[PDB]
């Protein structure tokens, strides 16, 4: 399967006193591996997976240096946007940035990302060709012009196509025991009777990794989306994920229905029946 490395940055201005709250997190696939929080005592990039703790002091000094510089960029960004949108210094505002790279099963570059939002709305995004920009409004147009004049797309492309994938490959090897392991879902069904005429069947998928999964219901071998509910995939808290799907059925016809589970860790999809 494909793999990814992604960094997520959030800065929130604090108008009453002091500088913005800055939080940075890094993921390989669905595994968080580093964090920085401006409100934390260390003022260091910190590990959040065992395999990154293998990295020595020079790594941690470099990532701390870079993340603090990222923090200052976002501080300045909040100021710039306040000017572009003619807002006062009274209100709190948010900037968000995400960047990173995808590789395929062969670990070769697949796609790169670098995109930005202000107060939860699209601001500017690097297009898939890594050579042009999607600017959502006239403020973002001004940024696009600046970045086009300074050859920013070329700088980001070099990182996203090269250094980024080199980092990802290094992490995939160093964290092979978990990062290259798939955890297949542990599945079971439950039954809930609301009346003498109605029953709910729920199909559970637990303790799986990666997070991507498909749960589907069939009646008599054909798909059914009606009278079905599918919850958002949720973290178990131990690195794995959970999901359920439910279908409302006439009491006594439970046996007609089947839940089907598709996941990377399953060579063949599973079928469950009450």
């Amino acid at each position: 399967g494909s793999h990814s490395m992604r960094y997520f940055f959030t800065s929130v201005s604090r108008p009453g006193r002091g500088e913005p709250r800055f939080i940075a997190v890094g993921y390989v696939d669905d595994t968080q591996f580093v964090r920085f929080d401006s409100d934390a005592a260390s003022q260091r990039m910190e590990p959040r997976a065992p395999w990154i703790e293998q990295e020595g002091p020079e790594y941690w000094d470099g990532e701390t240096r870079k993340v603090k510089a990222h923090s200052q960029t976002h501080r300045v960004d909040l100021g710039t946007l306040r000017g572009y949108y003619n807002q006062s210094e009274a209100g709190s505002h948010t900037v968000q940035r995400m960047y990173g790279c995808d590789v395929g099963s062969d670990w070769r570059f697949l796609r790169g990302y670098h995109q930005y939002a202000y107060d939860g709305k699209d601001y500017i995004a690097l297009k898939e060709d890594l050579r042009s920009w999607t600017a959502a409004d006239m403020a973002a147009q001004t940024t696009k012009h600046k970045w086009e004049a300074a050859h920013v797309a070329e700088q980001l492309r070099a990182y996203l196509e090269g250094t980024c994938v080199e980092w990802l490959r290094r992490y995939l090897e160093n964290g092979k025991e978990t990062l290259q392991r798939t955890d297949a879902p542990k599945t079971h069904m439950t039954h809930h009777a609301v009346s003498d005429h109605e029953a709910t069947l729920r199909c559970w998928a637990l303790s799986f990794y990666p997070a991507e999964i498909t749960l589907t219901w069939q009646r008599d071998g054909e798909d059914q989306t009606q009278d079905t509910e599918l919850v958002e995939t949720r973290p178990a808290g131990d690195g794995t994920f959970q999901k359920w799907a439910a279908v409302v059925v006439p009491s006594g016809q439970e046996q007609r229905y089947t839940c089907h589970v598709q996941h990377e860790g399953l060579p063949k999809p599973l079928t469950l029946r009450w």
Binding site: G62, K66, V76, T80, R97, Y123, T163
Partner: peptide, 9 residues
Amino acid sequence: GLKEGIPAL
């Protein structure tokens, strides 16, 4: 690892 520098808006 993070990029060496990111662009300001």
